[PDB]
Amino acid sequence: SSQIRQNYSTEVEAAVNRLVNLYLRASYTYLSLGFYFDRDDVALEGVCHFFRELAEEKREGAERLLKMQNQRGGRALFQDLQKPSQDEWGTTLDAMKAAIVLEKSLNQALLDLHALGSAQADPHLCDFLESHFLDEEVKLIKKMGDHLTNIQRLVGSQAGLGEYLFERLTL
Amino acid sequence: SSQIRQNYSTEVEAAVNRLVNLYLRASYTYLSLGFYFDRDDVALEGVCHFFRELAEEKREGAERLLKMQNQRGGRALFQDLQKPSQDEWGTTLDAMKAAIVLEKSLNQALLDLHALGSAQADPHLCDFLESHFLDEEVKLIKKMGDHLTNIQRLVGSQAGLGEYLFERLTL
Amino acid sequence: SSQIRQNYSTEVEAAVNRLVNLYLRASYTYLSLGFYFDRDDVALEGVCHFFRELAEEKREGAERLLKMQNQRGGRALFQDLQKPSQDEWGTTLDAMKAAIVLEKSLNQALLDLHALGSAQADPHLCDFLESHFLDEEVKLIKKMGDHLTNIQRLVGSQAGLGEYLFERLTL
Amino acid sequence: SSQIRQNYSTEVEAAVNRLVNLYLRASYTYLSLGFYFDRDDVALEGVCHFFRELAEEKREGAERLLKMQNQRGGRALFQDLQKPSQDEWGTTLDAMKAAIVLEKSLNQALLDLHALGSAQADPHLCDFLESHFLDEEVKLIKKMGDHLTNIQRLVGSQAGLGEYLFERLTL
Amino acid sequence: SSQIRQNYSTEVEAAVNRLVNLYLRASYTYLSLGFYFDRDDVALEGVCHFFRELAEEKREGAERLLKMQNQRGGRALFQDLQKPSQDEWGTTLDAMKAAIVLEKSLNQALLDLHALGSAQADPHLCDFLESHFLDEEVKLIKKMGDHLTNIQRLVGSQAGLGEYLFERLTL
Amino acid sequence: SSQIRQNYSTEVEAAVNRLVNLYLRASYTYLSLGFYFDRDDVALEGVCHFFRELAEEKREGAERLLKMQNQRGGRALFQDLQKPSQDEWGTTLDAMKAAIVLEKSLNQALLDLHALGSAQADPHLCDFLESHFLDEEVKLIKKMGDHLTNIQRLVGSQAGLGEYLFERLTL
């Protein structure tokens, strides 16, 4: 039992460890998406770079949650990281749809945890999510929605052409 | 129905559009106050500049609310902008009293919307108001109260003299 | 009655206040067009930026007219600002057509006021419109006509593709 | 009754004045701890500097609370500052334990006030504590817990040696 | 009993601890005066800054006395800090009169302690007061007397006007 | 079947994907070791930093293997990442022993894969391991052996003292 722990519920502690698992899983998914778009038979470098950058952001999320865990006197506990849901990710469109689905699930986890922190009267947890995750997630989802719209407008008749142009002129 | 929208109530969406209307109305009021104090028969440049600067701040408020609207997947809807409540604004004192009344009504709108966001369990809205409006509004109201006190001390016997001196040495 | 006013007709004064209303209305229209193209389901950033920049130019127009009003000893009077004619603006093409219609109506207001100033023998008003509005308006209308032509050439068979390319390579 | 005060409960106002008293009392305690470790018969300069720096941080806390008090239109009221609980503070270990006890009581005061602000629907107070105190307090308590652990590992057989080494290589 | 203490009377040691209490009390008084003049209904920023700066100087005085205490091998002992004599400080005039009364009492404490050090044949104490307090106190009292005279000349018929002008053009 | 693949055996391809799994698992282990030594009740910052840096190096290893996979025309395939073998890592000594065990198993995987590449007559694979992994691994193992020796010499009678000193003066 901790020298520092104050106002830090076991329920929050545990949900924080699950969120770390989710973020790491997200990182892994993006590592898989990034290297799929680096395949010689896919070869969309801008799409590759976009997903690799998200791998990194999601790893950094987990790391910030682990630091906060320790700052509040909780105990990091790690679980198995499950492999991404797919081994091949189809088109840029398919991939960006899967990424928005993923982000909406991270975002709902963030909101679920905020609500718990709020029911537990844990304002530092609530602020920590407010300052470092909730707005970042909103901005990212807006950006992906923006991309989806542009990808979709570009499919038209000429899907290859549109995929090339999006990668070259937007990403 | 939106690709991005998550945890964003129609009630919040609508209140955000009304707040945009309020901020724009406030901007307009300050544009009118600014140009009244630029009249050759009023000629108080420091008072002019103070109100023009607030016109600009309130426009920027509306713009930030419109951006957030889009970031959450809501739909901006614009209404008629009603003209300022007055065509002539009297003394610096009169004007600063009207500006504090205006700001207290914007501030109560902000607090009403925070409360709604809080009842709707919308922590991103609550944080967004916290980070960009509530403290800014408090600081502005403090500053106007400070000015009012100084204007009032300067009326004394010699109202013209006091109005000149306030504009020259404070604004 | 004014210490400074000379050769400044009540007819000009009033038409100047109406032109201010028109410019502000134009600004508002462009604010609405700008945020429509920032929607996640429209997502054309170059179109957004083009219209936001015009919001700003039209606000600055009104501000210069209000300053001149005061410089000539007239009295600024503000009216209700009516909401933009549309809540959704369709394609880039639709939007640019609406913007040219708007600008042609501002331009005819400018010319109507010049003619009045000319009938009233008010050379300072005539010069002020000449120096700060008439050429600026011509240049803007030329630019919009240029854009319209390019948008139209790009519709061809492939409307999404053409809308993307115009926004990416021209705006 | 105030020209500026809005949504600022007498209950919050009073609790803010008590928190100011607590922070100042904390400052005083740290001033006493700092000068005890500057005694020629204690002579641990790094421990001295650590506590003097906290004296300063806690004074600055009180000052920020007094500023906010005025910004919200409340009235600062000062009380007697009670002397520190001890005139001599024993070992570095003893001192750091007393400092963690102190900080946990400041931290619980902060949380109590946040809860009150939350029950009173006072989001500006809640944000102000979130932005300037709650995380700072968590970080400080983590740091003191870190120090305690290191002090404790160093006692072992050789308490003087461990106290010297901690002061020389950590503080 | 001290390894370092030489020619340092218990009578001096104790009077030094009382002087520390006096200086801290003075600091507190000035902290209260500073925040009173930051009230929105008082709003005299130059008066605020003048008193806050004295809060700081008097804290630094106490700190230098505590350092010397330790340098001579005496033992710092802290007492209760009594609250300022007033919760509201009236006009700038009232406040500056109270500050001169306060400073004259600090100054008489300094002189009383010098006399004791002189009777005890403690030249280092006498020099320490000479080098760091007696002249500083004289200069401060001269400055406050200068301010009082200027405040008094400005009351005349027009007290608000004079209070504003003093704060704007002198402080 | 690949446009680029030449002299790249399915046996190598598969072993490369398993090595990626091993490196990622190693990264995870080091992430867990790093945050254990950041606990307030462990508090050895130099040990924390040493393991976090290895988390990063092992992630970069996996990333370089995934890039090479794609460069040779193989297909990255990801598996479940198993959780670290321990939730708590004991002393610095315990941790460094576990890290050397881990590295010896990575190193044997590297050598096993080199041998396979050598039996398959795949000189590019052999060179790639030579240039980017085998020497790096040797250097790291030497460094850990160096650390182990120093940790062990420092246990002596005084284990806490030795753990503190190693972290402060070596890491």
Ligand SMILES: [Cl-]
């Ligand atoms: Cl799975």
Ligand SMILES: [Cl-]
């Ligand atoms: Cl109206």
Ligand SMILES: [Cl-]
């Ligand atoms: Cl209308």
Ligand SMILES: [Cl-]
């Ligand atoms: Cl007491």
Ligand SMILES: [Cl-]
């Ligand atoms: Cl008292």
Ligand SMILES: [Cl-]
């Ligand atoms: Cl396992």
